[PDB]
Amino acid sequence: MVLLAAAVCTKAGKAIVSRQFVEMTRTRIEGLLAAFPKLMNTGKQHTFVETESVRYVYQPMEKLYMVLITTKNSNILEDLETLRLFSRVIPEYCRALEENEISEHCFDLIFAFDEIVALGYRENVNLAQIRTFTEMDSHEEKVFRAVRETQEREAKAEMRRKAKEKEVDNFVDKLKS
Amino acid sequence: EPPSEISLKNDLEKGDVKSKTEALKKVIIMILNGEKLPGLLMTIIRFVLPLQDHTIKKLLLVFWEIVPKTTPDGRLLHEMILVCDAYRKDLQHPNEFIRGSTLRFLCKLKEAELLEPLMPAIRACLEHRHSYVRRNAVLAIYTIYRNFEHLIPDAPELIHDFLVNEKDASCKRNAFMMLIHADQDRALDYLSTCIDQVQTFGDILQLVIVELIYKVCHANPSERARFIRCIYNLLQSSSPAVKYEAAGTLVTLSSAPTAIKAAAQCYIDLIIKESDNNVKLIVLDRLVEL
Amino acid sequence: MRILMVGLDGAGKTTVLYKLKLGEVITTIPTIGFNVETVQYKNISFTVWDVGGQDRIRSLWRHYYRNTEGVIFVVDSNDRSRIGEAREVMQRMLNEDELRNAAWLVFANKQDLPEAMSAAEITEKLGLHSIRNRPWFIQATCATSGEGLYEGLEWLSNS
């Protein structure tokens, strides 16, 4: 993990959608987080705030915020890419932007979190390709036609049966000393 | 006397899957509250072992996952073993994505009577030429290691040998992450091996070692040279990530005036290069510590 | 129709099934659970629960207590063991009323596989001789044999 939740946010004091990598507690962790986020703490601007060693990572994208959270150190850029990246992905994933579309393609969207990121690891590239992996496959089909068919033959037949029946060193020395 | 639970039931017929989808969403929302009162279980039960609807299964499944399962019925609703056999098959499924997806789920999953021969089952699935599937096992296993590590007991080595068989960086990266959590030692042995090779390689896996090494010294040291030999190589350092860590780890390790200088430089340039201010501040903070 | 294959499945009770379904054989671990197939005839598509009569699974089938429409009893005709005992159980099916909504078939399977009883011998023995408020013609299979089955069945859906 490098993120116990990704929650995609809309301005509302409320985060439009979320997923809980790990359950234990109740929303109050998440619920409390939601509250704080909605409040924004009046704070003016800035796309990042970490407070109390918790990264609250966000990106306004419009009236929307996409949010990630973490507490101990990270390499920034990567991160950014993601926020941004989210901001690339959605109109594809759930269709454009307005909660509803997403409301219909919730399943798709959550699926995307997992898919995209396996526990804080940047899994791939290529969205379409990303579609590919599941509920879009190939193997299963290959297998099915042949198999189904084979069985079918047995069945058909059955129908009848039925039917009828240097450098290092510089350092090293210095140090060594 | 009658209820809309039933109203949903006919819809499902009416559409098939489609209607059911709707039902899932509703159910979901209903579920979302907590809320539901049972009975549809039966329906679900009835149609689903004989039905496909993959997506739906995925919805279903997930639903099961998020929702409880040690349900006041048991534990299980009590069928947690029987239905699974199809699923086990799916899990068996020659069909690799399908297994992988399951696996993904499975990493989320943790339902034991079902697991046991699925332990066998999984083992087979590891062999499948797909790194996606195999990788998925790495999470899954991780999931075991806390829940019922023991379930499998021979693993840390088994993995470690596995690594030997292995060569997909993605999977490797993972492999490390888990491996040290099981036991560092194996990683280390390998570490010894890898020492020269590292430089050639992709970062992500490299990172993970940096954490590990840290904890052990405060507890105890005497280990250096072998490391050093490498470490110096690491004093190439060049990705912004690498560099970011690389100076950071160094300080962790050392603070010799020479050390002080080395890291310092890295920063200074970095900064200079640097653009995201947020970042800039951060290092200060470290610095502030320093 | 809901058609029921019970007894402990893994014996090739399941074989019996897999043989129907793909032509194949038990290439599963011996199977406690629901095994499902739909077989279409009179286009009543018979949904077969091949379910082990192993402990829980026998014990617990209440959601499957609903209303029957077809009976296969898949038989170890080398079993001549749990059948009296079975008879003793079987009564409670008899004592079920859902259970009286099927014109059926007991299938004697596993004939080659060791031997079998008098078609009659069994008939009393499971307590089978005694019915009528459901039809009750008898049909032997084996699990490496069985034909004319379908005569049995023919009458049966067309009851």
Swiss-Prot record, chain A:
It comes from the Eukaryota. It is found in: Cytoplasm; Golgi apparatus membrane; Cytoplasmic vesicle, COPI-coated vesicle membrane. Coiled coil: none annotated. Signal peptide: none annotated. The modification Phosphoserine is found at S177. The modification N6-acetyllysine is found at K166, K174. Belongs to the adaptor complexes medium subunit family. Delta-COP subfamily. Oligomeric complex that consists of at least the alpha, beta, beta', gamma, delta, epsilon and zeta subunits. The coatomer is a cytosolic protein complex that binds to dilysine motifs and reversibly associates with Golgi non-clathrin-coated vesicles, which further mediate biosynthetic protein transport from the ER, via the Golgi up to the trans Golgi network. Coatomer complex is required for budding from Golgi membranes, and is essential for the retrograde Golgi-to-ER transport of dilysine-tagged proteins. This is Coatomer subunit delta. The lineage of its organism: Eukaryota, Metazoa, Chordata, Craniata, Vertebrata.
UniProtKB/Swiss-Prot annotation, chain B:
Predominantly expressed in the upper one-third of the oxyntic mucosa and in most regions of the pyloric mucosa. Ubiquitously expressed including platelet, liver, heart, spleen, lung and kidney. Transmembrane segments: none annotated. It comes from the Eukaryota. It is found in: Cytoplasm; Golgi apparatus membrane; Cytoplasmic vesicle, COPI-coated vesicle membrane; Cell membrane. HEAT repeats lie at residues 78-113, 114-150, 222-258, 259-290. Brefeldin A induces dissociation from the Golgi of the beta-COP and presumably the other coatomer subunits. The coatomer is a cytosolic protein complex that binds to dilysine motifs and reversibly associates with Golgi non-clathrin-coated vesicles, which further mediate biosynthetic protein transport from the ER, via the Golgi up to the trans Golgi network. Coatomer complex is required for budding from Golgi membranes, and is essential for the retrograde Golgi-to-ER transport of dilysine-tagged proteins. Oligomeric complex that consists of at least the alpha, beta, beta', gamma, delta, epsilon and zeta subunits. Interacts with CAPN8. Interacts with SCYL1 and PRKCE. Interacts with COPG1. Interacts with ARF1 (myristoylated); this interaction is required for binding of COPB1 to Golgi membranes. Interacts (via trunk domain) with ARF1 (via switch I region); the interaction is direct. Interacts with KCNK2 (via N-terminus); this interaction increases the channel-mediated whole cell currents and promotes plasma membrane expression of KCNK2. Interacts with STX17. Interacts with TMEM115. This is Coatomer subunit beta. The lineage of its organism: Eukaryota, Metazoa, Chordata, Craniata, Vertebrata.
From Swiss-Prot, chain C:
It comes from the Eukaryota. InterPro entries: Arf1-5-like, P-loop_NTPase, Small_GTP-bd, Small_GTPase_ARF, Small_GTPase_ARF/SAR. GTP binds at residues 8-15, 31, 53, 109-112, 143-144. Pfam families: Arf. The keyword Nucleotide-binding applies. Belongs to the small GTPase superfamily. Arf family. Interacts with RUD3. Interacts with VPS13 (via C-terminal part); the interaction is direct. This is ADP-ribosylation factor 1. The lineage of its organism: Eukaryota, Fungi, Dikarya, Ascomycota, Saccharomycotina.
